[PDB]
Amino acid sequence: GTFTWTLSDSEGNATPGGYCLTRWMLIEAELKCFGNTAVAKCNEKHDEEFCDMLRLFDFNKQAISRLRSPAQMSIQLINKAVNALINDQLIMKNHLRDIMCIPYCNYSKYWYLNHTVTGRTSLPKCWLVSNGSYLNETHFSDDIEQQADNMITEMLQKEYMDR
Amino acid sequence: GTFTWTLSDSEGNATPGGYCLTRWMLIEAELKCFGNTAVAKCNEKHDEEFCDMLRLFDFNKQAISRLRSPAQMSIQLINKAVNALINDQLIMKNHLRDIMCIPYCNYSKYWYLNHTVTGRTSLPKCWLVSNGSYLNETHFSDDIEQQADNMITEMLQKEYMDR
Amino acid sequence: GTFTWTLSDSEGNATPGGYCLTRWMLIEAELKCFGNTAVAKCNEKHDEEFCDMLRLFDFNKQAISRLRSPAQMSIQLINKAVNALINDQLIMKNHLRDIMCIPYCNYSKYWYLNHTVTGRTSLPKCWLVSNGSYLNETHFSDDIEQQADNMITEMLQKEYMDR
Amino acid sequence: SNLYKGVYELQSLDLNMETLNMTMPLSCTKNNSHHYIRVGNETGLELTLTNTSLLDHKFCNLSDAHKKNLYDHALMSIISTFHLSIPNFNQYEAMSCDFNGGKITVQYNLSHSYAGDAARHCGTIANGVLQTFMRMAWGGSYIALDSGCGNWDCIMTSYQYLIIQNTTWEDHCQFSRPSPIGYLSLLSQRTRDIYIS
Amino acid sequence: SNLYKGVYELQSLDLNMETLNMTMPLSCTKNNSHHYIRVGNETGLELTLTNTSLLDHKFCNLSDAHKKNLYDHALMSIISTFHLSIPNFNQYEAMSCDFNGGKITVQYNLSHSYAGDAARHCGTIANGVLQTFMRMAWGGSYIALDSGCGNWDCIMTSYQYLIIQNTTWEDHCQFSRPSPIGYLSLLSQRTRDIYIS
Amino acid sequence: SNLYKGVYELQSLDLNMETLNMTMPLSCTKNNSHHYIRVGNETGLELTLTNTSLLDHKFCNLSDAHKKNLYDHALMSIISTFHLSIPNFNQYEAMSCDFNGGKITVQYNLSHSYAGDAARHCGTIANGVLQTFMRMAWGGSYIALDSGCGNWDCIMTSYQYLIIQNTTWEDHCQFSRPSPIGYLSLLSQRTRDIYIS
């Protein structure tokens, strides 16, 4: 269990069934754990607000743990890190949507489908805001249904013998 | 039916079997309709002249419809939009090819394979030019044959029971 | 047999079973040949040190062969070419890892799994360095095992009838 | 909507972006006239939209700031990033600064729209400042005087000044959650949008 | 070739890039000495390659253009984007401009290759101008005096001046179809290629 | 480890980056105080870390270099790329240059950390120079005076000068293999990290 989205040399959290978001990643409770086959999508998709935040948190952990960074935050390290980590193109797409009155991601809130029968998840995707606030799931609608189709497909392709 | 390549909040043309190129996207006739499973390739491929034009047209439609843009074209909006939309790397590859005497895409003309027996298409790919004009299909050759192999594969993987 | 990672108009080495690295690409011996289905990964992965070097060599060959480039190396052509060819984001990730004491790729050495029973290969991936030198395969470890799993999967999905 | 073509829950997340505080700046909104940037432990910038003025100098004493130093690192980088993200601004008197104990204090003078009512509509440097402001902090920037979407640029607000000063990091982020995104948006690409020459 | 390993047709497309006219500039070729940029309804730029000269000033009065304004927006941004995409150009007398009723009129003076025949081969600012010119409009730029591929830079053409002026949008695009790509290429990345300092 | 869940060998590669010599610059390390850049057939730059000084001028005569020319192309582009990749550097006396027969000779004066021992820790322009130096050539840059990872910026080395001069391309790359990566890293993105204004 290794990832390409991480800066670490496979230091951890890529092997115990999934990657867990801790209580310092989340405002609420703890340990939202996403299976490794879901998390691995962040290794190559190259366009997802959740995955981009995930890399940013991974950076933060390494930077604090290894550098200490007393007094200054080494903003110059960040300038290097963003070119390495943040998917500039996506940030600008969300910016344009705000300009244009189109629901856009402000990166704080995510949703996912949780197949609680088995515990599999789709990974978070951004919930989106418009007109100063969050969207209803009733207008968000079809994108959820489409995400469900993708999980359904995975559960069928999960069969080891074939598919 | 939703897309990631679009700026719209799934406003339309992602659900009625495919996405149609209208008479204002095309110089000739109307409604060149590409099935949704083909169009969806533009959601993640991240390297295709046709898909890049598709996003640019989607932008244009939204910008005109929602902003009106009297007097000025808001070139400054464009500067933001291109970083969000145009796949700079590909544009430069076509530029180098022109410098180097290598056939390159000037983005006006595209070709696709149309399996007219069933109506499925491969999506357009750029036809390419060299020495001031368009290439012959006889030298273009093998790339068409390779695209056919991909459609053949899809038609076989289309089987719902397995593959 | 055509590639998207190449600048050439399918000039060659995309059809004879695979793409060969010649004695001027390699310091040692000659003709390290990677099957076309492996090489093709460089067409879309968009994040691999080996593939990035491969494109850089392809450029070099075309630039020398077609331009001659006496006296000057046309550094200005390079400035255009890098934006077209080098995956800036990856270079910066390896740079950060050096800063951070994390094993990183300095791009000279690669490893791959060679299924010598059949001759299939995984394509090279960077071997990595830390503390001024190369890593042991014993700490590199699991990433090799994971690469083997991927080749195993391919050999099973290779079945033509299904999978 | 409950379940989605099988048994699935939405189970939403809300990320604690505050824990990113020790490595990159986080911006937020306090109220209609105030926005903030956290840059480190108990420190950050205060972005004030006002009708008053603190600095009546027409000089931006950067030749001292970058030679005598005596300034806070990181805070300087943030303001330079911000300042240089503004299109078409030269100086035009506005954007004077005084580091002689006022440290980072700089002000933009949005009043240079001239006249009154919308004046230099789609041309004032003030809009360049407002658009940059709304990238430095965004999402929660909507309660600032910029009002109405689908109306890009040509904002022409009623505040006369944007004042940026160093503050302590009190619990300022009452209107919107802190986020690294504003800074990252200004930093990433920039879009140049130079205008000049 | 008809069918391709099953029954398939090529069914080609030709995109109507003109309909993109209201949001971003479109460049094209009219004939060997003329190229054009559409920037809005019935308006755009004329790019002229000539041996004559209209502007004999050695001043580029940008200090007036960006202070007194009185200039067309967007057209100014396009010329600044173009101008700043040229490598190694300072001024060197060339690239003077006059906005005192001539508005955007600017000229590049390609004659600064000096001497005659290829002169400052691989070094003249003129090549920097020509390469930028051929990005502003491209594909259909091949009928300009730049001639021969596989010969990068060191172009050394026979025209002495590149003159850029504001025009009306008549049906100028006779040699090549209008395209946003030229502008996007200059705008995107730029490649900097600064040379200076 | 031999085989990996079936019969597989590692079969490693070591790329001959030297063959890239005719199209883009290749940097390497010779020993602790010397690094080199190949730019063409039998030519390249010598990067020297020393305690001595060759150029006592406080002028960088770029106004001559870019007007009178008489300089080597490509070598000039590399030094400009390098120079402009340094954050917060203005001139501050340091970085003077003399092209009057010394051609590219330029020197950075790392001694402007002032005082002694770590002095302007996390603030000296010298660190800006060292960090740029370690991107121009990297991997094999670790034997330079920069010592210890996990200690970003605030390097404060003991050499007083970085001197860059044109040399012949002898077999200088004894400590590390030549690589295009250093140049590409400086060229690509840059990260700007301007500080100034």
Ligand SMILES: *[C@@H]1O[C@H](CO)[C@@H](O[C@@H]2O[C@H](CO)[C@@H](O[C@@H]3O[C@H](CO[C@H]4O[C@H](CO)[C@@H](O)[C@H](O)[C@@H]4O)[C@@H](O)[C@H](O[C@H]4O[C@H](CO)[C@@H](O)[C@H](O)[C@@H]4O)[C@@H]3O)[C@H](O)[C@H]2NC(C)=O)[C@H](O)[C@H]1NC(C)=O
């Ligand atoms: C993306 O966009 C969303 C949508 O606008 C933003 O969400 C808002 O975030 C702010 C800041 O966290 C929230 O502000 C809080 O409002 C409370 C008001 O209470 C009433 O309304 C809530 C609404 O949910 C009811 O549950 C409640 O019963 C009441 O009826 C205040 O009480 C809060 O004060 C507490 O926190 C502050 C934090 O600084 C402390 O200083 C206070 O002492 C106190 O402990 C707070 O002011 C706002 O409610 C959110 N709106 C919505 C719709 O969720 C996101 O922040 C934005 N994301 C980013 C990163 O920009």
Ligand SMILES: *[C@@H]1O[C@H](CO)[C@@H](O[C@@H]2O[C@H](CO)[C@@H](O[C@@H]3O[C@H](CO[C@H]4O[C@H](CO)[C@@H](O)[C@H](O)[C@@H]4O)[C@@H](O)[C@H](O[C@H]4O[C@H](CO)[C@@H](O)[C@H](O)[C@@H]4O)[C@@H]3O)[C@H](O)[C@H]2NC(C)=O)[C@H](O)[C@H]1NC(C)=O
């Ligand atoms: C990508 O690269 C291609 C290849 O060079 C460019 O294609 C050319 O585009 C131009 C402009 O649209 C075409 O110019 C036209 O030429 C006609 C000449 O007629 C003869 O040749 C054609 C060739 O197909 C025969 O069919 C015909 O029977 C004749 O033998 C003119 O009659 C046209 O004039 C009409 O349109 C203009 C438009 O401004 C009007 O002003 C006129 O009044 C009139 O209505 C026109 O001049 C050229 O033929 C195309 N060449 C090829 C090989 O297709 C692409 O434009 C370029 N794409 C981009 C975006 O740059």
Ligand SMILES: *[C@@H]1O[C@H](CO)[C@@H](O[C@@H]2O[C@H](CO)[C@@H](O[C@@H]3O[C@H](CO[C@H]4O[C@H](CO)[C@@H](O)[C@H](O)[C@@H]4O)[C@@H](O)[C@H](O[C@H]4O[C@H](CO)[C@@H](O)[C@H](O)[C@@H]4O)[C@@H]3O)[C@H](O)[C@H]2NC(C)=O)[C@H](O)[C@H]1NC(C)=O
């Ligand atoms: C990525 O990171 C790696 C790891 O540090 C770098 O690898 C080093 O590269 C240098 C330059 O090629 C190598 O330097 C050579 O050292 C030899 C010393 O011999 C002893 O050590 C070797 C170690 O393998 C033993 O095999 C040997 O038996 C001895 O015990 C010298 O003899 C070599 O000299 C020859 O080549 C030079 C080239 O300029 C000629 O001038 C000489 O005349 C002579 O022919 C040479 O100095 C070093 O050994 C490598 N280390 C390791 C661990 O492999 C990569 O270069 C770096 N990649 C990039 C692109 O930066």
Ligand SMILES: *[C@@H]1O[C@H](CO)[C@@H](O[C@@H]2O[C@H](CO)[C@@H](O[C@@H]3O[C@H](CO)[C@@H](O)[C@H](O)[C@@H]3O)[C@H](O)[C@H]2NC(C)=O)[C@H](O)[C@H]1NC(C)=O
């Ligand atoms: C996706 O859905 C699964 C299934 O509902 C979630 O797993 C469940 O998570 C809760 C909260 O963490 C666990 O509750 C536990 O209860 C005991 C007391 O009974 C308490 O001591 C623990 O501290 C905790 O609160 C619950 O057991 C667990 N269910 C299973 C089967 O393990 C999962 O959290 C959801 N999403 C993600 C991203 O993890």
Ligand SMILES: *[C@@H]1O[C@H](CO)[C@@H](O[C@@H]2O[C@H](CO)[C@@H](O[C@@H]3O[C@H](CO)[C@@H](O)[C@H](O)[C@@H]3O)[C@H](O)[C@H]2NC(C)=O)[C@H](O)[C@H]1NC(C)=O
């Ligand atoms: C891919 O191939 C299919 C199959 O050939 C194409 O569909 C066909 O498109 C034509 C032109 O739009 C349709 O012709 C119609 O004829 C009637 C009169 O008979 C006229 O009134 C209509 O206005 C139109 O001209 C044709 O019916 C249609 N075929 C089928 C089976 O529906 C398709 O257009 C090709 N490519 C793409 C990208 O759409």
Ligand SMILES: *[C@@H]1O[C@H](CO)[C@@H](O[C@@H]2O[C@H](CO)[C@@H](O[C@@H]3O[C@H](CO)[C@@H](O)[C@H](O)[C@@H]3O)[C@H](O)[C@H]2NC(C)=O)[C@H](O)[C@H]1NC(C)=O
């Ligand atoms: C992946 O593994 C395969 C299988 O081991 C490698 O193919 C083998 O490569 C060697 C060296 O090129 C060939 O040796 C030849 O020996 C004759 C004399 O017996 C000599 O005249 C030739 O010049 C050459 O040295 C060996 O025959 C060949 N094996 C087979 C079955 O063809 C392959 O090179 C490895 N990796 C890659 C990336 O190619």
Ligand SMILES: *[C@@H]1O[C@H](CO[C@@H]2O[C@@H](C)[C@@H](O)[C@@H](O)[C@@H]2O)[C@@H](O[C@@H]2O[C@H](CO)[C@@H](O)[C@H](O)[C@H]2NC(C)=O)[C@H](O)[C@H]1NC(C)=O
């Ligand atoms: C900050 O801006 C004010 C201008 O503020 C307003 O808008 C002007 C167009 C004008 O209508 C003023 O009365 C409004 O208060 C600058 O003060 C004046 O600037 C104008 C030129 O635009 C000049 O003619 C006046 O004489 C100036 N006022 C005085 C008392 O001399 C002010 O100087 C700017 N300050 C800085 C630091 O930029």
Ligand SMILES: *[C@@H]1O[C@H](CO[C@@H]2O[C@@H](C)[C@@H](O)[C@@H](O)[C@@H]2O)[C@@H](O[C@@H]2O[C@H](CO)[C@@H](O)[C@H](O)[C@H]2NC(C)=O)[C@H](O)[C@H]1NC(C)=O
């Ligand atoms: C535009 O360029 C001309 C130079 O044009 C040609 O190339 C020169 C090298 C020379 O051979 C001229 O005769 C050719 O016509 C500028 O005019 C001359 O510039 C030279 C310096 O290069 C100077 O010695 C001459 O005295 C100038 N001519 C006159 C009559 O004084 C011209 O000034 C340039 N104009 C602008 C606005 O840049």
Ligand SMILES: *[C@@H]1O[C@H](CO[C@@H]2O[C@@H](C)[C@@H](O)[C@@H](O)[C@@H]2O)[C@@H](O[C@@H]2O[C@H](CO)[C@@H](O)[C@H](O)[C@H]2NC(C)=O)[C@H](O)[C@H]1NC(C)=O
């Ligand atoms: C290159 O730098 C030296 C400074 O070198 C050292 O560090 C200084 C802080 C000081 O302690 C010197 O004694 C050390 O040798 C420049 O020389 C001196 O600069 C200081 C100002 O920093 C000035 O007060 C001294 O008078 C200068 N020395 C003399 C003999 O006048 C030197 O000028 C710099 N050269 C260039 C080209 O930049």
Ligand SMILES: *[C@@H]1O[C@H](CO)[C@@H](O[C@@H]2O[C@H](CO)[C@@H](O)[C@H](O)[C@H]2NC(C)=O)[C@H](O)[C@H]1NC(C)=O
């Ligand atoms: C945002 O909150 C700040 C702090 O509470 C307000 O600023 C203070 O307002 C009181 C009003 O009586 C003044 O006495 C203080 O002197 C102000 N302090 C500072 C530092 O300005 C601010 O006015 C609020 N803004 C809005 C729009 O409500």
Ligand SMILES: *[C@@H]1O[C@H](CO)[C@@H](O[C@@H]2O[C@H](CO)[C@@H](O)[C@H](O)[C@H]2NC(C)=O)[C@H](O)[C@H]1NC(C)=O
């Ligand atoms: C700052 O002072 C100016 C006057 O110098 C105010 O300008 C106008 O005030 C009227 C009445 O309140 C409004 O209806 C106009 O719309 C204002 N001008 C603009 C451009 O909007 C201005 O409102 C004052 N600003 C604030 C925030 O109080």
Ligand SMILES: *[C@@H]1O[C@H](CO)[C@@H](O[C@@H]2O[C@H](CO)[C@@H](O)[C@H](O)[C@H]2NC(C)=O)[C@H](O)[C@H]1NC(C)=O
């Ligand atoms: C903005 O920064 C200045 C500079 O550090 C702060 O002023 C200093 O406060 C300390 C408190 O112990 C004094 O010892 C220094 O003498 C003050 N320096 C100067 C130049 O006066 C100022 O307080 C900061 N602003 C805020 C709101 O915290």
Ligand SMILES: *[C@@H]1O[C@H](CO)[C@@H](O[C@@H]2O[C@H](CO)[C@@H](O)[C@H](O)[C@H]2NC(C)=O)[C@H](O)[C@H]1NC(C)=O
């Ligand atoms: C490109 O077309 C333009 C417009 O038709 C040509 O410019 C005109 O040429 C006539 C020739 O008799 C002159 O009388 C006009 O004064 C010119 N007008 C302008 C605005 O310059 C131009 O010469 C053509 N270029 C080529 C290469 O054929």
Ligand SMILES: *[C@@H]1O[C@H](CO)[C@@H](O[C@@H]2O[C@H](CO)[C@@H](O)[C@H](O)[C@H]2NC(C)=O)[C@H](O)[C@H]1NC(C)=O
């Ligand atoms: C502009 O005038 C110059 C002379 O001042 C012409 O320069 C040369 O003319 C001869 C004869 O026509 C050509 O064979 C040379 O190749 C031209 N010089 C260069 C650098 O090519 C120039 O041709 C005239 N330009 C045009 C387009 O008419």
Ligand SMILES: *[C@@H]1O[C@H](CO)[C@@H](O[C@@H]2O[C@H](CO)[C@@H](O)[C@H](O)[C@H]2NC(C)=O)[C@H](O)[C@H]1NC(C)=O
């Ligand atoms: C380039 O722009 C100028 C400035 O608008 C145009 O000249 C104006 O034309 C109108 C026509 O009604 C006159 O009322 C203005 O007085 C003119 N302005 C100036 C400064 O003279 C000019 O025509 C444009 N060029 C072209 C070819 O359209």
Ligand SMILES: *[C@@H]1O[C@H](CO)[C@@H](O[C@@H]2O[C@H](CO)[C@@H](O)[C@H](O)[C@H]2NC(C)=O)[C@H](O)[C@H]1NC(C)=O
């Ligand atoms: C260059 O000369 C300076 C003195 O002008 C030397 O500075 C210090 O020397 C002592 C004794 O060798 C060291 O322990 C200090 O650590 C040095 N200063 C710094 C900042 O490290 C300096 O060592 C000489 N440099 C070299 C490479 O010889």
